[PDB]
Amino acid sequence: PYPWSNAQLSWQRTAFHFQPERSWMSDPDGPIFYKGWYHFFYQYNPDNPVWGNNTWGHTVSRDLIHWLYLPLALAADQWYDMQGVFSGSATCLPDGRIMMLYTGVTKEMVEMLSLAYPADLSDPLLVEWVKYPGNPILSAPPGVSPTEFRDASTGWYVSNGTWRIAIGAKYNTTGIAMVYETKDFKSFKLLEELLHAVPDTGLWECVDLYPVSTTGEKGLETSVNGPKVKHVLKASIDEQQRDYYAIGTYDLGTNKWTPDNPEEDVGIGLRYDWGKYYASKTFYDPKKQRRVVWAWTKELDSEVADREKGWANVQTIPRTVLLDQKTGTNVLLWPVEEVESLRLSSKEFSKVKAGAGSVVPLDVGTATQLDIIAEFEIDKGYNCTTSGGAAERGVLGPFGLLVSATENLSEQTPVYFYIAKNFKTFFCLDESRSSKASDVSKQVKGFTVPVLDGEKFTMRLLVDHSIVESFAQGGRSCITSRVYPTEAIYGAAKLFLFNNATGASITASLKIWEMNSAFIQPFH
Numbered sequence: 172p173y174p175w176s177n178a179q180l181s182w183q184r185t186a187f188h189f190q191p192e193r194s195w196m197s198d199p200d201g202p203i204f205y206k207g208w209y210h211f212f213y214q215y216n217p218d219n220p221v222w223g224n225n226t227w228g229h230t231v232s233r234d235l236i237h238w239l240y241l242p243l244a245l246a247a248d249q250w251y252d253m254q255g256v257f258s259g260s261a262t263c264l265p266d267g268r269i270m271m272l273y274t275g276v277t278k279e280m281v282e283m284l285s286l287a288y289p290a291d292l293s294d295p296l297l298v299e300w301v302k303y304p305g306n307p308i309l310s311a312p313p314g315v316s317p318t319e320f321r322d323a324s325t326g327w328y329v330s331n332g333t334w335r336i337a338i339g340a341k342y343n344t345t346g347i348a349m350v351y352e353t354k355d356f357k358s359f360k361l362l363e364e365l366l367h368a369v370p371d372t373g374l375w376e377c378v379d380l381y382p383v384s385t386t387g388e389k390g391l392e393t394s395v396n397g398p399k400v401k402h403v404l405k406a407s408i409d410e411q412q413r414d415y416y417a418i419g420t421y422d423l424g425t426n427k428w429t430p431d432n433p434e435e436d437v438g439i440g441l442r443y444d445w446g447k448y449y450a451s452k453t454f455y456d457p458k459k460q461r462r463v464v465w466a467w468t469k470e471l472d473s474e475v476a477d478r479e480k481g482w483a484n485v486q487t488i489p490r491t492v493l494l495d496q497k498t499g500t501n502v503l504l505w506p507v508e509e510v511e512s513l514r515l516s517s518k519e520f521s522k523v524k525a526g527a528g529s530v531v532p533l534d535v536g537t538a539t540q541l542d543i544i545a546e547f548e549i550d551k552g553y554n555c556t557t558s559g560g561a562a563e564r565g566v567l568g569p570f571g572l573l574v575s576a577t578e579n580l581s582e583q584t585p586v587y588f589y590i591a592k593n594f595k596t597f598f599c600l601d602e603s604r605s606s607k608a609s610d611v612s613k614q615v616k617g618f619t620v621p622v623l624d625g626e627k628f629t630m631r632l633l634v635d636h637s638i639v640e641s642f643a644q645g646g647r648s649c650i651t652s653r654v655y656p657t658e659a660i661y662g663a664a665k666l667f668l669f670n671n672a673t674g675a676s677i678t679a680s681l682k683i684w685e686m687n688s689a690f691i692q693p694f695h
């Protein structure tokens with residue numbers, strides 16, 4: 172347990188990530204774009220920087236970056252949600268109505284579906300929210316435990332006025348997605364056919380079903396279906412606390428979602444992000460025609476420090492989701508382009524050489540609010556999770572960057588590539604020496620990333636105080652983590668290009684932008 176100082180703790184607050192004024196924040200709730208505003212809701216504890224007393228916080232922005240706080244949307248003030256207003260999604264009907272479905276928890280820990288809607292649809296800020304007088308609207312079916320009945324998805328249209336929603340759950344150890352039909356969002360009929368099921372995964376929370384285009388570069392409206400359309404099915408795997416997705420096809424007539432590759436099904440395949448990244452939710456953005464993904468990153472320090480600093484957890488910069496057309500077997504996640512409006516000034520590092528076992532300093536000034544874009548070239552079984560990080564030297568790795576580093580390398584956070592034997596390219600983030608404090612996470616995170624002939628090894632890094640977001644090969648693989656250094660803070664945080672390979676030297680070109688505050692404050 173580290174004697175954290177006020178100066179060390181205040182430094183952890185983010186400059187441009189969404190974060191409430193104080194206290195605990197969790198799952199993204201009912202993201203929508205309505206009347207010129209991006210709407211974001213989130214699990215929020217009014218009382219303490221720990222999970223509990225769940226309410227829905229509410230915030231708005233013109234651009235998905237410059238957020239403005241609004242009053243609480245939903246409180247724990249009805250018998251059916253007295254134990255908490257858990258997560259939920261929004262469906263926007265063609266008549267202009269917004270239906271917000273959420274799970275409310277009773278004093279007996281019973282989870283039941285409820286309906287909320289705006290008190291005034293003419294208000295673009297959607298400040299006030301009303302709970303349907305006839306709540307609660309749906310309780311667990313005979314095969315599902317009433318204490319584990321959660322997370323209604325955004326609905327998709329069938330025909331004749333009927334919509335479909337997904338509620339994840341489990342049969343014994345099999346993860347499942349149930350589908351309910353409705354016409355009025357007040358009565359729900361359980362379909363006999365499950366959306367999909369995968370053995371040995373466990374509880375599926377926060378289930379997401381959405382379509383992706385195979386030809387374009389735009390997101391698809393949630394109800395879009397066809398023979399040229401593929402469907403991503405995503406679930407939060409409760410037992411692991413990590414989000415998994417799979418690429419497949421969905422048939423309206425059958426209601427079955429079928430994976431493109433059974434060996435990479437939901438829960439046993441790929442993730443949006445290989446780091447700390449949970450309860451991810453997507454919404455369709457009509458203005459720029461994107462599908463955007465929200466996900467929260469938990470603190471990786473001690474609860475003692477969380478209580479000391481008075482706040483816990485952040486949301487990541489929202490990302491676009493698009494099908495990787497060059498592989499056909501993964502998605503591409505990339506920060507929304509509006510993050511670039513935070514860029515103040517740039518510095519370029521052209522063709523910087525880094526020999527075997529070397530470390531090259533990159534003078535950028537302050538290295539705590541950065542947007543880094545780098546390309547790597549190599550001049551003329553492994554597993555990130557069980558590797559020794561940047562210390563484990565190989566013939567063609569590890570090489571990459573050192574963020575949140577100290578002058579004398581006493582604290583460092585490597586984000587790196589590793590080429591192992593055909594070639595498997597690994598992308599990892601190494602926490603093992605991030606901080607001199609022992610009451611923080613020290614794991615090494617990462618996975619393989621596809622690298623195609625003719626491509627340079629590229630990485631993007633978003634450095635924002637206590638949170639780093641990393642992107643390999645244009646977003647084929649992402650790693651989000653938290654850092655809590657004791658010395659590598661304020662002016663003392665440095666950036667390094669590093670090569671700890673033995674067999675080769677690397678040549679990197681970089682560009683580094685300093686990043687402004689998102690100026691997240693209350694609404695005017």
Ligand SMILES: *[C@@H]1O[C@H](CO)[C@@H](O[C@@H]2O[C@H](CO)[C@@H](O[C@@H]3O[C@H](CO)[C@@H](O)[C@H](O)[C@@H]3O)[C@H](O)[C@H]2NC(C)=O)[C@H](O[C@@H]2O[C@@H](C)[C@@H](O)[C@@H](O)[C@@H]2O)[C@H]1NC(C)=O
Nearest residue numbers: 313314315316340341342343344345346347365368370371
């Ligand atoms: C979750 O796990 C439980 C416990 O294993 C499953 O219940 C078990 O179902 C078995 C059938 O697959 C039962 O075994 C045999 O039943 C047949 C029926 O003709 C008989 O020939 C023979 O005498 C066996 O007993 C077993 O009795 C039962 N175990 C318990 C403790 O209840 C459960 O399956 C689900 O519930 C049962 C009651 C059936 O309705 C199944 O169809 C149903 O799937 C597992 N849950 C799921 C969703 O698969």
Ligand SMILES: *[C@@H]1O[C@H](CO)[C@@H](O[C@@H]2O[C@H](CO)[C@@H](O[C@@H]3O[C@H](CO)[C@@H](O)[C@H](O)[C@@H]3O)[C@H](O)[C@H]2NC(C)=O)[C@H](O[C@@H]2O[C@@H](C)[C@@H](O)[C@@H](O)[C@@H]2O)[C@H]1NC(C)=O
Nearest residue numbers: 410411413415438439440441552553554555556557558614
């Ligand atoms: C790379 O190395 C890591 C760390 O060893 C592997 O992840 C670990 O997988 C273990 C299972 O193979 C998990 O350990 C336990 O599994 C048992 C099942 O018998 C559970 O009952 C128990 O609760 C444990 O969880 C463990 O969760 C996991 N460790 C960590 C730190 O994540 C990894 O395997 C891969 O990742 C895991 C999360 C799954 O997705 C696997 O399917 C997947 O293969 C190793 N990857 C390799 C060898 O390819």
Ligand SMILES: *[C@@H]1O[C@H](CO)[C@@H](O[C@@H]2O[C@H](CO)[C@@H](O[C@@H]3O[C@H](CO)[C@@H](O)[C@H](O)[C@@H]3O)[C@H](O)[C@H]2NC(C)=O)[C@H](O)[C@H]1NC(C)=O
Nearest residue numbers: 528529530560561562563564573580583585604669670671
């Ligand atoms: C590149 O690889 C080298 C070789 O692994 C890395 O140097 C090694 O760093 C580790 C971690 O700090 C050192 O282990 C330490 O040992 C000391 C006692 O000697 C112990 O007090 C610590 O608790 C820790 O276990 C190790 O000394 C050192 N090895 C060598 C040969 O230098 C180096 O850090 C890597 N470069 C990076 C990450 O930029």
Ligand SMILES: OC[C@H]1O[C@@](CO)(OC[C@@]2(O[C@H]3O[C@H](CO)[C@@H](O)[C@H](O)[C@H]3O)O[C@H](CO)[C@@H](O)[C@@H]2O)[C@@H](O)[C@@H]1O
Nearest residue numbers: 197198214222225257258259321322376377409449450
């Ligand atoms: O906040 C409600 C919302 O969160 C979800 C998905 O994140 O899971 C709820 C869940 O998570 C909490 O569990 C423990 C609290 O004991 C805490 O360590 C963790 O950080 C929390 O996120 O709560 C129950 C426990 O009561 C767990 O089954 C589950 O992980 C989602 O299901 C829900 O809508």
Ligand SMILES: *[C@@H]1O[C@H](CO)[C@@H](O)[C@H](O[C@@H]2O[C@@H](C)[C@@H](O)[C@@H](O)[C@@H]2O)[C@H]1NC(C)=O
Nearest residue numbers: 195216217218219220221222223224225478
């Ligand atoms: C939810 O609200 C209640 C009443 O306002 C708070 O007391 C809870 O705080 C927790 O419970 C009290 C009795 C004490 O043990 C404190 O240490 C706890 O944090 C609050 N619940 C949560 C989970 O923050």
